[PDB]
Structure formats: structure tokens, C-alpha cells
From Swiss-Prot:
<comment type="subunit">
    <text>Interacts with drc1/sld2. Interacts (via BRCT1,2 domains) with crb2; a single rad4 molecule interacts simultaneously with both 'Thr-187' phosphorylation sites in a crb2 dimer.</text>
</comment>
<feature type="domain" description="BRCT 1">
    <location>
        <begin position="1"/>
        <end position="89"/>
    </location>
</feature>
<feature type="domain" description="BRCT 2">
    <location>
        <begin position="93"/>
        <end position="182"/>
    </location>
</feature>
<protein>
    <recommendedName>
        <fullName>S-M checkpoint control protein rad4</fullName>
    </recommendedName>
</protein>
<comment type="function">
    <text>Essential component for DNA replication and also the checkpoint control system which couples S and M phases. May directly or indirectly interact with chromatin proteins to form the complex required for the initiation and/or progression of DNA synthesis. Interacts simultaneously with both 'Thr-187' phosphorylation sites in a crb2 dimer for establishing the DNA checkpoint.</text>
</comment>
Length: 183
């Protein structure tokens, strides 16, 4: 029984302990493992969007499935427990949310735009942040002015136009901020 025949798996933003567990179980399941992001990679297991590997997959590898860290351990346990593994291999259930680990704040944006943006952020696995804090990942700004904008620059927080959100959603992955800079 080799369920994951044809699968080539790579990890990013995963701790060594879980990474070893993943590589071990994935190999048992019949998959190939890669330390480097090579061409034959089919599945990227990610714990963050803010890595060279994730960014590469986002801009150049639309064919690659971005997976959550819990995919392999769950699939492996189901295998061992004698459960019948259906065609799909729990991939769809364990696809990483598009805005995983994104913490989105807004400025210079009115209603009902503000309400609609929050709607799509929550729907796609992100966190909405009414006030700006240092752990905010993206500030969506209508204009380049005001207290939030200035603190965003000072703290080196991504400042993007709303198109960042729409195209990240379309792509099913977080896109890099410079493509959506304010003019
Ligand atoms: Cl890693
Ligand atoms: Cl490798
Ligand atoms: Cl690499
Ligand atoms: Cl999603
Ligand atoms: Cl906000
Ligand atoms: Cl757009
Ligand atoms: Cl796209």
C-alpha cells in the first residue's frame, strides 16, 4: 500500500521536530520528500506565508497545493487505523487557508467597503484587526496619510491597496506587497 505514490512534498516554516515527523510519515505513505524547493515538488506544507519558499510558490507555481501542517499526521493516522483512503487523500480538507496568518487592518476606507472587506478576510482564513498593532501583517489603505499609515511605515508593516486582497483570493495564496503599493 503506497497511497502517496507520485507525491513530492516540501516544507516551509515548519519546526524540525514536526518536519522530521512529516518526512518520516510521508515516506511511509509512499511519497518523496524534499528539503529544497525543487521542480518536481507537488505539495508544499506551510506554517507561514512570509518565507522565500511560499513566495516562490505564490508567484511561479500555481500547480502546487499549499498544505497545512496537520495534513500528513492526520492522513497517516487514518491509514494505520485501517480506514479506507478515498481518492483525494484528505487534500481538500487540509488545504491551507488563503489568508492563513494574515492580520488585516484598514485605514482611509469607508462603509460599506470596510464591512465587505472584513467579510472576505474572515471567509478566507484571515484575522481582522480594528486597531493597528505591531503584529498586524497588512494595512489596507485608501490613501497614504493618517496615524495608522505613519505607524505602519515606521514599524515596517506592509501597506497595500485593496487589490492585494482581491487578487490574493483569486490566486488562492498571499501575494507580495510591492505589487499593490499605493501610488
Ligand atoms: Cl521548514
Ligand atoms: Cl532535496
Ligand atoms: Cl529552496
Ligand atoms: Cl481559504
Ligand atoms: Cl481596521
Ligand atoms: Cl482586483
Ligand atoms: Cl490568479
Amino acid at each position: 500500500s503506497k497511497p502517496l505514490k507520485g507525491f513530492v512534498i516540501c516544507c516551509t516554516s515548519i519546526d524540525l521536530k514536526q518536519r522530521t515527523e512529516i518526512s518520516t510519515k510521508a515516506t511511509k505513505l509512499g511519497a518523496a520528500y524534499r528539503s529544497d524547493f525543487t521542480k518536481d515538488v507537488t505539495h508544499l506544507i506551510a506554517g507561514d506565508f512570509d518565507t522565500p519558499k511560499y513566495k516562490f510558490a505564490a508567484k511561479s507555481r500555481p500547480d502546487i497545493k499549499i498544505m497545512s501542517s496537520e495534513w500528513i499526521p492526520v492522513l497517516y493516522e487514518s491509514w494505520v487505523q485501517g480506514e479506507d483512503l478515498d481518492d483525494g487523500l484528505l487534500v481538500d480538507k487540509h488545504l491551507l487557508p488563503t489568508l492563513f496568518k494574515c492580520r488585516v487592518c484598514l485605514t482611509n476606507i469607508g462603509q460599506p467597503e470596510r464591512s465587505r472587506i472584513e467579510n472576505y478576510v474572515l471567509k478566507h482564513g484571515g484575522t481582522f484587526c480594528p486597531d493597528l498593532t505591531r503584529d498586524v501583517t497588512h494595512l489596507i489603505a485608501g490613501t497614504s496619510s493618517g496615524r495608522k499609515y505613519e505607524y505602519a511605515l515606521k514599524w515596517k508593516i506592509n501597506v497595500v491597496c485593496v487589490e492585494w486582497l482581491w487578487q490574493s483570493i483569486q490566486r488562492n495564496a498571499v501575494l507580495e506587497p510591492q505589487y499593490f503599493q499605493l501610488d
